Amino acid sequence: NTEVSSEIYQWVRDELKRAGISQAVFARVAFNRTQGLLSEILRKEEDPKTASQSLLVNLRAMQNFLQLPEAERDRIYQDERERSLNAA
């Protein structure tokens, strides 16, 4: 109804295939922490019902990001090279 369901994992797969970006990006914008973790979380696909504390927090952040408007995600997905260097 309004709880953390398996849809969270399915959303990430759909968002990644729809948007068309690397895991490093979606992982940095979804839940900044450490690369490679998203792989283990997606591989197991364990439901929050039988998930750990650290796991529940991961899906919680991913949900808020997916719930946010596309306009916001677009600005985040685009803005990557904030420190755009210059050629002398």
Q: 81 a known binding residue?
A: no
- Closest by CA to 35, choosing from 22, 48, 18, is 22
Q: 50 a known binding residue?
A: no
The experimental technique behind this entry is NMR
Residue 80, both tokens: 């990557």
Domain boundary assignment for the chain = 1-88
- Closest by CA to 59, choosing from 73, 75, 45, is 45
Q: 56 a known binding residue?
A: no
Burial class of 18 by CB neighbour count within 10 A (0 to 12, 13 to 18, 19+): exposed
- Closest by CA to 79, choosing from 21, 38, 39, is 21
Residue 41, both tokens: 């979380």
CATH code: domain 1-88 is 1.10.260.40
Helix (H) or strand (E) holding 5: none
Backbone angles phi, psi at 74, to 5 degrees: -65, -40
Q: 36 a known binding residue?
A: yes
* End-to-end Cα distance, the chain: 57
Q: 66 a known binding residue?
A: no
Q: What is the DSSP annotation of 31-61?
A: --S-TTHHHHHHHH---GGG--HHHHHHHHH
Q: 33 a known binding residue?
A: yes
* Amino acid found at 59: L
